[PDB]
Amino acid sequence: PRLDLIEQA
Amino acid sequence: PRLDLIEQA
Amino acid sequence: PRLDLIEQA
Amino acid sequence: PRLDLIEQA
Amino acid sequence: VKKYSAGVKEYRQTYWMPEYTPLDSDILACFKITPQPGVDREEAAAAVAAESSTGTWTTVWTDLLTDMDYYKGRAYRIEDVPGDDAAFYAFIAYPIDLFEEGSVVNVFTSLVGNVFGFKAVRGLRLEDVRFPLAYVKTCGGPPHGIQVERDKMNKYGRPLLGCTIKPKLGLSAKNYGRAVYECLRGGLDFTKDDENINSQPFMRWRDRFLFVQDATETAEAQTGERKGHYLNVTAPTPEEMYKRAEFAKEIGAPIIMHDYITGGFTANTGLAKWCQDNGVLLHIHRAMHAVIDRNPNHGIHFRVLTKILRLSGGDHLHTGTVVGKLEGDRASTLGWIDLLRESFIPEDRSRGIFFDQDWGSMPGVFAVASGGIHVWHMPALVNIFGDDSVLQFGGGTLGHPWGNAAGAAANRVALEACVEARNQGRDIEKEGKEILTAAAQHSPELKIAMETWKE
Amino acid sequence: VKKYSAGVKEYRQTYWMPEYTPLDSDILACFKITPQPGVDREEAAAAVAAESSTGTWTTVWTDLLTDMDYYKGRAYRIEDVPGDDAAFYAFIAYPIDLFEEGSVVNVFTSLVGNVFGFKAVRGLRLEDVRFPLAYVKTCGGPPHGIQVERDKMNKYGRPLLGCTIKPKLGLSAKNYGRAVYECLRGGLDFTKDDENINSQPFMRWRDRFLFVQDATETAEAQTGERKGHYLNVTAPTPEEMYKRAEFAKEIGAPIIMHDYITGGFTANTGLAKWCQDNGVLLHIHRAMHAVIDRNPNHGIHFRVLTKILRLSGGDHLHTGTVVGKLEGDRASTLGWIDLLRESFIPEDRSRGIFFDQDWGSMPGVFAVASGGIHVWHMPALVNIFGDDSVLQFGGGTLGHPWGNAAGAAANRVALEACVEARNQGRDIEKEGKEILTAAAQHSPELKIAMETWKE
Amino acid sequence: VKKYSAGVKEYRQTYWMPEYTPLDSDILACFKITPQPGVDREEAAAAVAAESSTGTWTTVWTDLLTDMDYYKGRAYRIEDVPGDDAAFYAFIAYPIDLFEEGSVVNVFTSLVGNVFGFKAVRGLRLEDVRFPLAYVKTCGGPPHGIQVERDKMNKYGRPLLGCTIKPKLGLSAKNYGRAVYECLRGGLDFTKDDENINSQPFMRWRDRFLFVQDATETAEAQTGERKGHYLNVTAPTPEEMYKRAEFAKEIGAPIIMHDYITGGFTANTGLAKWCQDNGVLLHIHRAMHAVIDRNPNHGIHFRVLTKILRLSGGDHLHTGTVVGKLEGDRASTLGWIDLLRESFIPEDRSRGIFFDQDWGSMPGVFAVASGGIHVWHMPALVNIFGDDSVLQFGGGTLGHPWGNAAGAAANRVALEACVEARNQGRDIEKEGKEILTAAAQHSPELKIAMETWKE
Amino acid sequence: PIDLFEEGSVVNVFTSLVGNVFGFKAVRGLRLEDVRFPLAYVKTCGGPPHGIQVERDKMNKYGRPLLGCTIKPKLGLSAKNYGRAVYECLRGGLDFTKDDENINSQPFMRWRDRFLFVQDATETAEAQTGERKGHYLNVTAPTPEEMYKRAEFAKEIGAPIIMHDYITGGFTANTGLAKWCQDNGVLLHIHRA
Amino acid sequence: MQDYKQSLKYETFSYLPPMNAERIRAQIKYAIAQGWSPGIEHVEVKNSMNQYWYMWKLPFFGEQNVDNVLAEIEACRSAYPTHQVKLVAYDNYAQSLGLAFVVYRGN
C-alpha cells in the first residue's frame, strides 16, 4: 500500500 | 427577567 | 433489588 | 516585501 | 420476555408503548419521521426508540441479564405533522439512567448517533428534546449568564454592540489591533475575532492577543467605558485551547470565544468550566449549524442545538438575524431565543416548542445577532431581540466611509436612539426611519452611514 | 483595488477567477451549488469563495491594509452536475496561508462555517477537498496506521473481527465483562463499547475498564491470540477524556475508542496525539455522520469527513457496510475506502473523487464494517473490504442461539473460510453460499448461525 | 412588600404559607417543635422557616433588592404529634436555589445552623428531609454501592462478616496484623480498625497499613476467598487523610474507613469522590451519632443523618443493631435501612418516613450491624438485615475461648447455617436455637462459642 | 586564564576558541591542533556518565573488546523488521546493536514503536544466549524536550544504553543528556557525525 | 444452546479447520502473486505472543517458486520440531506483512 501509489509514481 | 417567569409562577 | 422497586414501578 | 515576491507572483 | 429465543424480532413488540406516561426525570425527544412508503408508523417510531437506546437488530441473550423494561427507550405518542401527510411526529421517552450526568456529548450521541441512517425513513428530523430539571442540574451551564455578565462589564439598559474584524483573514496582528482600537474607541462595547481566525502564518495567536489587549485597554481609557474583544481560543487540541485561554486571562482579556460545533462539545464543555473557574466570559459561535439545521426534513432543529449550548456552556450564542427570516420562521426563532434566555418556556407548537422546558436557576445566554446588518436594521433588531442581546456589525462598522471609529459611533447612535424611542413608548419598527432620521440630524456619522447602505 | 470606496459590491468582480491555475500548496474545494433561480452561477461561486475566505458583504477599508490578491479564496472553475441541471460544481482554491497548520478544525470551520446558510442557494454540498501534501505533513494523522497496528497486535492475513456488546445500554460492569469475555474467548479479535457507553449510573467507566481488562486478559490466555476491547473514552470534558485514556493505558488496554464528530475534532486531535505518545490504538466511531452526510443536496459528503478523520487521527474508522448501499453509492463507498487506506488516490469522477489526493507517507486507516450483518454477509464483506478491515458483528454474535462464544466462533469460521477460498482463487461472492455451507459441515456453530438468520 | 419600613415584624406575615403546594424541586423538612407555652404554632413554624432560610429578626432594606417570594423558605403545614400534645410537626419547603449543588454541608448547615438555639422552643427535632431527585443527582453518592461492591469482592448470597480488632487501643502494628490475620483466615470477610485507631505512638498508621495488608494477603491466599480490612484514614487534616488513602491504594488495600461526623462532611465528601476515582471501597463509621440522634425532643433523627451519608458517600454505614432496640424503635430502624438501601421509599408515618424519598439510580449502601453481638444474635440479625448487610463481631470473635480463627469460624458457620435455613423457608428467628444447635454438632468452634455467651 | 570560561561548559570554552578567529583575512588557514584543559577545569565538568570500568561491571563483560552492529539499511525498515534484524544479530553473539545515526523518528518507523520492538528483541536474545545485550537507541531529537522524552522512555522500558550525535545534536544537548544518563544509570554511546 | 469451548488460537485462519497442503499452497501462491516476499518464523510455544519470533534464515526476497517456500518450511520444522512455525509475507511497499499464518502449532 502506502508507498506503492505515491504522487511520484 | 430570570425569576419573574419561573415554573412556580 | 435496585430496579425492582423504582418510583416508576 | 514578504508577499510581493511569492512563488505565485 | 423471560426466556431467550434467538432471531430477528419486530421493534413494535417492545419499543412502542402508546399508554406510557413519561416520568418527570425522563428525557423526551420529538422526531419528525418522513418514512418510506410501506413502513408502519409505530414500527418506524419503535425502531427509532430501540436503536437510539437499548435495541438491537436481532434478539440477544444479554438483554435477560438486565431489566429492559426499566432501561429501554419507548415511543409513546404518534402525531400528524400539520399540513404534511408524508411525515409524523414520534415522541420517545428515555429514562434518565441512560445518560452520563452532565454530558451533553453522551445525550447528543445517543439521540443522533445512528437513527439518522435508517433506510426505513426518507428523512429524520430531531425537532425538540425535553431535558428534565434533574438532568439540567447536573450540567455546568453558562459560566456567568446575562445578569452576571452585565454586572461584570457594568453595562445596563441597552443591547450590547459588537463588531467582527474584517477581512476575515489576511491582517497582521498590529493592523488587527488598529482595527480593534478604532472600533472600540468609537463606541462599540465589543469586537471579535472572526471564526476562522485561530493562529495563522500571517497572524500568530500570541501576537494577536497582545496587540488586541493593548487596543482594548487604550480604547477603554479613552472612552471611560468597559471594552472587550472575543479572542478566539478554538485550537487544534485541548492543550492548545487551554493555553490560549490561560494567556487571555493572564493579559486581562475579559472575554474569549469558541466554536462549539466545529471545536466540539467536549472541548466546549471543558472551556465553559474553565471560564467559570477563571472569571472569563465565553462567547459561542455556531459554525456548521447550517449544515445540520437548515433542511426541514433531515437534521436537527437549531432549537435543540440551542438547548445543548445552554447546558454545555456559553455566555453569548450567535443566533442569526430574524430580519432575513420569514414570518413562519420568525416565530420559531423567537422560540429558541426564549429557550436561550428564559427560565421556564411553556409548550407552544406555533413556535416549535414541543415540550415544557424548565431551566430552573440555570442562567440565560445573550442572544447575538449578526450578518449583513447595518444601521437601518437597528429598529427591527432592538424590537425583536430586546436588551439582553448583542448586535454585531462587522461590515456595518469597518465599511463606513469614514472608518471604524465613525462606523462604530454611527451604530452606537442608532442603537441608543432606538432604545430611547422604545422607552418613550414609540413603535420603533413602524417609526424606524423617522427615529433614525431624527438621530442623524445630530450625528454626521449616522447620516452618511444611512446614505451608504439602503433602507 | 487601490483606493477605498465604501458600499456594497458584487462578489464576482474579485472572487471569480476563471483563468486561475491552482498552486500545489492550495487547498481546493468542490461544492455542489443548487442555487435559487435568478442568481448567476459565477456570482454564487464567487459568493461562496468570498464568504468562506476573506470576503465581506460590504467593502471595508481594512482590505487595503493587506494584499487581498494573495490571501483571497477564488472560484476558478464551474462545471455542470451530470444529470442534474439545477446544480453545478464550483471549484474554489484557498491559499494554504489561510489555515492554521495541523488544524482540521480551522480548515473545516472556514469551509463550512457560514456558506451553508446562504439564501442565494437552495442547497450547498461540499463534495471534496484537496488537501495538499504541504498541509498533510503538518497534521498528526493516525497514531499508528494499518501496518503498525498489525505488527502490534500480531495479526496478519485476514480482516480483523469485532463485536459491539449489546444491549447498547443497561448492563452492569461485571456482566459487561462476562459478555466481553465470552466473545473474545470464542475467536473475535476485538470487542467494543457501544458509542453510547461512557459512564452511566448502571455502569461507571472505571468499573467497566477494570472488568473488561480482566475479561480481555483471561480470553487472551485461553486462546493464545492477542485480544482487545475498544474502551470508550468519550467524555464530557477533555480532562475527563484524558483521565479515562490514561487509566486504559495504566491497566494495559491496547485500544480505545472515540466519537470524533460528537466528541469533537479538538478532542479527537488531542486524543490522537496522546495515543501516539502512549502507544494506544485509536478506534474512531462516526456518530452523527448521517445528520451531515446523507442528504445529497445539502451537507458534507462523507468522503470529506473521511479525509478529516485521517488527518485528525484514528487507527480505525467506522465506514458502514456497502452491502446495503446501491451500486451507485457502492463506487462512492469504495472511493472513500481508498481515501482512508491508500497513499495516492487519483481523480475519478465515477467514484466521486474530484481531486488527486496525495497522502504521502501518512499511514492508512482500518476500514470498519458493522450494522445488521451476520455470517451470510461474510463473503461480500471480505470481497469488498479486503484484509485491512475490521468486521464487527454485534447482534451477529450476541444473538447466536448458543451464546457469545459460539457466535464468535461461527463468525470466525465464516471469515476464515471466505479468506481461504479467496486465496484459492474462488469468486467468494458468487460461491458464498457454497463456501459457507462447506465450512458449516465442520462447525456446528456456523451451521446453526446460518439457520438463525436468512441468506 | 414593595416599600422599605424599618423595624421588627412578625415572622407569620411572610413565612407561614398554609396554602403553599411544594414543588418537586423543593427540599422539604419536617421539624418536631416543642414550643414554650405562650408562643403560637404558626409563628414558631414561620420563625423556623425564616431563620433557616432568608429571614431576619428585623426588617432589612436589602430584601427589596431581590424577590423574597421566590427565595424564601415557607412553613406550609402544621400537624399534631400523635400522643404528644406539647409538640407539633412543622413542614417547611425550601426552594432548591437556596443550596449549593452537590453539598450536603450547605444543606445541613442551613437547616440546623441556628434554629436549634431558639428561646421560643423548648426543643427542636429535625425528623425528616425530602431531598428532591434534582438535588440528589448533583451529589456524588456512594462511590460503588452494594452491587458493585459484591462484584468487586466476588461475594454473593449472604451477609458479609466483619470484626473490629480489640482492644480498641494499645496493640503494636505487628500484633495488630496478627489479630487481623487470625480473624481473616478463620472465615471473616473483613476486619476493621477501631474508630479510635488513627496514628498513635503505640502504632503509627504506615506501620499498621503495611502489617495489615500483609495479614490480608496471607489470609486470602490461605482461604481462597477475597479479604479486606477497613484501614482508618480519619486524620487531623485533609492532606493527611488523602496521604493515608493513597498509601492504602498503593499497597493494594481494597477498603478504607472514615468517621463522617467527627471527621466531618467536607472531608467525607472529598474522600468519597477520591474513593470513586481510585476504586477503593469506603466504610463509614457514625461516631457521635448518639450525641445528636438519641434525644427524641431535641436533635436530628438518625434517618436524616442516613440520607446525608448516602448523598455524601459511603459503601457501608454503621447502623447499630435492632436487637437491642424496642419494637417502637425497630420500625424506625427498618425505616432508615430502607432509606439506606432502597431506590424509592414511600411515605410511611408508622416507620417515621414523613416524605416520599426517591433516590433514582443512586446506589444503595451496605447496612452494618455491630455492638455486643455474638453467635446467638445471628438468626435475628440475618432476619432483620438480610443479605445486603455486614455483621461485625469484634468481641464475638476475639473473645472466643480458642482465639480469633476459631471465633471467626464459629461466626461464619452460624451465619451460613442461618442463611441456609432461611433459604429453605424456615422461620430463622423462631427456630434460631434449633438451627444453631444443629450447626454446632458439626462445628466444635460454634459449640463452645454458644457456651461462652448466653442465649 | 581559567576565569575566562564558564565552569563545566565545553560549549563556552569551545565557542571562545573557535568563534571568530577562523574567519581572519590575515590567515589563509587556521587549525586548532590541541587544547590543554587544566585539572582545575576538568573537575568542573561532568565527564562520562559511567566510563569503561563501570560499564564493564554493569554489563558484566570482561576480557575482550565488545562487538556491535549498526542495523542496515540505514533507513527504510519498519519497527518490527528493525527488531527482527536486532534480534538475529544479538542472538548470534554480538554484545550490542545500534540505531543508525540517521534513525530518529521517521514516517516509516516512529521512535516509540522502534524502542518497543528493539527492547523486545534485546530481551529475547538475552534470554536465549545467557549474555547481557543492548541496543543503542538513538535519542537525537529536534528539541531537548523530545530528546529527554525518548531517553526517559528507554529507561522506562529497561534499555541499558542510548546513543546521541554530539556535534549535530549539539554540545548543549549532549552535556544535558550525559548528566541525565549519570542520574538514571543509562550508558551513553556518542556518534561523531 | 451449545457451550463454546475456549482454546488458544493462532490468529489469521486459526478459526478455520487446519489447512491441508493444497490450502497452504494457495495462500503462498497468493502472496507471491501480490509481489510479497515469503518468510518463515518460529518460536517456542510459550513465547507465541512475543513481537519477535525467531527468523528462519532470511525472507525469501524475490522468491517466485512456492515449492522452495514449502521446502524451507519443512527444513525449519526439522530444525525446531517443537516450535510453532509461521509463514509470513513481507510487503515492502507498506513495510507490513501482507499475510501471516501459523502452519505448525508446536510441541
Author numbering:
A (entry chain C), B (entry chain C), C (entry chain C), D (entry chain C): 22 to 30
E (entry chain A), F (entry chain A), G (entry chain A): 3 to 457
H (entry chain A): 97 to 289
I (entry chain B): 4 to 110
Give the article text.
To ensure efficient CO2 fixation, cyanobacteria and many autotrophic proteobacteria concentrate CO2 in the carboxysome, a bacterial organelle encapsulating Rubisco and carbonic anhydrase within a protein shell. Here, we explore the encapsulation mechanism of the carbonic anhydrase, CsoSCA, and demonstrate that it is incorporated into the α-carboxysome via a carbonic anhydrase–Rubisco complex. The cryo-EM structure of Rubisco in complex with this peptide reveals that CsoSCA binds Rubisco at a site overlapping with that of the scaffolding protein CsoS2.
We further determined a 1.98 Å single-particle cryoelectron microscopy (cryo-EM) structure of Rubisco in complex with the NTD peptide. For clarity, we choose to predominantly focus our discussion on the higher resolution 1.98 Å structure (State-1). Of note, both reconstructions show densities for ordered waters and alternate side-chain conformers. The two confirmations are highly similar (RMSD: 0.22 Å) with the most notable differences occurring in the β-sheet of the N-terminal domain of CbbL, in particular the conformations of loops P37-D42 and G115-G125. The resolved region of the peptide starts at the bottom of the CbbS subunit (around loop D94-S99), runs downward within the groove between the two CbbL subunits, and ends between β-strand S345-I347 in CbbLB and loop P19-I29 in CbbLA, that results in a buried interface of approximately 700 Å2. Indeed, we observe this segment to form a single helical turn and thereafter an extended coil. The L24 amide and L26 carbonyl hydrogen bond to the carbonyl of CbbS Y96 and amide of CbbLB F346, respectively.
